[PDB]
């Protein structure tokens, strides 16, 4: 509670992971991700994604279960994708495959990521009305 109040998201993350407090885990990941977009290879701050890089098998299987059922929203899915990405780029892929239980999770969350890829790609597709409006505004003279 003191860490979540005063800031300090890395030791807050590992205490929320040790206590298994999932709403607090979503809050510490969402707050750290938002301040990561604010400031400026690395996607969270470096201390927190090193803290993600050094957690063991049952901790990362409960972390990926949390990422699994956050990915079913279209709202809380970005936090899940950043956490999945830092796990993927900070852990060993042979280890992640041979952990017992890591196929009934990644098969659960491949099609949800594909659904979100289709939706965000269509958002980029219909983002070109700005470009069409700009070419009309330049034809105006």
């Amino acid at each position: 509670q003191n860490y979540m109040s005063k800031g300090d998201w890395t030791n807050a993350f590992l205490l929320a992971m040790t206590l298994d407090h999932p709403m607090r885990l979503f809050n510490v990941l969402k707050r750290a991700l938002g301040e990561s977009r604010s400031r400026q290879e690395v996607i969270f701050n470096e201390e927190l994604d090193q803290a993600i890089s050094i957690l063991n098998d049952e901790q990362l299987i409960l972390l990926m279960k949390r990422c699994r059922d956050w990915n079913t929203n279209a709202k809380t899915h970005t936090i899940a994708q950043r956490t999945i990405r830092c796990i993927l780029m900070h852990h060993n892929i042979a280890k992640l495959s041979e952990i017992p239980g890591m196929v009934k999770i990644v098969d659960a969350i491949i099609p949800y990521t594909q659904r979100h890829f289709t939706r965000v790609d269509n958002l980029v597709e219909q983002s070109y009305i700005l470009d069409y409006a700009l070419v009309e505004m330049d034809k105006l003279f």
């Binding site: 407090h21 999932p22 709403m23």
Partner: protein, 43 residues
């Protein structure tokens, strides 16, 4: 895949996909969520 109920009785997973843990949530939200699933279990 879809979000089912929680697999242990120390947490709940709502259909949304977000989850609370019994110990972690505040007692006001425990009253609120008890009332909510009571209605959801009443309809």
């Amino acid at each position: 895949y879809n979000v089912g109920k929680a697999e242990k009785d120390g947490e709940i997973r709502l259909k949304n996909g977000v989850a609370m843990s019994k110990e972690e949530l505040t007692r006001e939200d425990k009253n609120r969520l008890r009332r909510a699933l009571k209605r959801k279990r009443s309809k």
